[PDB]
Amino acid sequence: MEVVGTIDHRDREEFRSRGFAILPQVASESEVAWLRQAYDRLFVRRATPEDFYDIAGQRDRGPPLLPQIIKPEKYVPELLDSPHFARCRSIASAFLDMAEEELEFYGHAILKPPRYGAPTPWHQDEAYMDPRWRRRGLSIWTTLDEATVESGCLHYLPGGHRGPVLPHHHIDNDDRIRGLMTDDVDPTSAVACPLAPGGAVVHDFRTPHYAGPNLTDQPRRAYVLVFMSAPAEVADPEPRPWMDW
Template identity: 30%
Template sequence: MSNQIDGDEYRISEEDKDHFAECGYVHLRGLLTAEDVSELEGTYDRFLRREIEVPGKDYCDMAGDYGREPEDFSIINVMLPRRYYPQWQGNIFERRAASAARQLCGDGMAIDYDQLLAKQPYKEDAVFAWHQDMAYWPDTPDTRTATFWLAIDDSTIANGCMRFVPATNRERELRPHTPQFGDRGDSHALGTDLMESDEPVPVPISRGDVTVHNERVMHGSGGNSTAGFRRAYVIAFRSEDTVAIERQLGFTHSHNDSGDVLNQVGVEGQTR
């Protein structure tokens, strides 16, 4: 059976469930229709134009330091848009992704954070270094994660689509990670290096498609060499218990979190 939409439900094939479990990621085609994406697009672009206020470092450049001027950003990053625009909560992407997260990870999944990532045109440095998301987060007993990466624009190799190293989610240890631009106070981005045995796979996807990945699979993306934006809308689901532990630690995924909170998490993703 192929994947199908039924209202707020997105029915995932057994083949795609197996791919997610084995490889750490999966490409789900047509999670949203063209009309669904258009419904979200106007609000998305209002965030990019700063018509919706996002304070401090939660509007920043993920490809450089926090000191750049917005017109110079290579990757416009908006953290926690559902916090800053509550009207977006419960939108069609959230509802359909919740259905898919339950099928991929089981019951008890909740939204941990959301994020907008827009690579501006002709930005060859709009690169996400290879990394594992768990390197950013506190260690918790239940690490189940389904991070949905929605293409607002067709995502291609030329404009910096997602790339994965399959099955790195099944390695016993996380790879060592280091800050990419100075220290964590200067820029949030972490990265790690590929090994000779790694075989990266680029995953171009169409507008309305998603990739979904877990907390341990290595992934990254290249720069944008095209004349258009590469806009993505990300929602990360984790277990309800894990989200509660994070919040008790004061870890909200906001880039405005204090240095003390960020420093609770080491570069290998373990709570200090």
């Protein structure tokens, strides 16, 4: 099928209120099929005489990292031409109350291997950003596969985008590429967002989120588009002592 869902006022309203939103079908079945074929080539599972995914971060990797490609549109420039990109930019515009032309953007590809046992710990995406420069923005996480709690779908802290950027620390101070985490989210307050293929979740830069391990025997792929404003000077910057400069 080639049908795609729509957004309405209620979608925007709950995004503003809760800091995240579920879009049941942002990519059509045929768009998902094409994205899957693209990932088949981007993420080559390669054998040795343990298999590894033949990308930076994996083939040269301490504990395993989540297989991911920053700005995959460099390798597959067919990506940002797409109706799916345009559709997502329009959604971002509606949700941020900003003209599409004002948005900076980039792509991000993720594959969670079968039986990948590490979670993505609680974090806010803004914790990765320079406290001297504020951007409004969001992420649109489009799944290529069923996403369930057991396969590693995202969980959010509703309303957390109106709270502080929580204290974060490196998972390993001597292995910073593993990323950041916060201990300051109550898991009983979390809400999970399972998705069908072609569905997406959208979240603000400040909404805390977590992803579980992939306890299933099938890879789980997501294509993430980030849309954001130009940076604005912050007069009194937060310390964020966990920042990797």
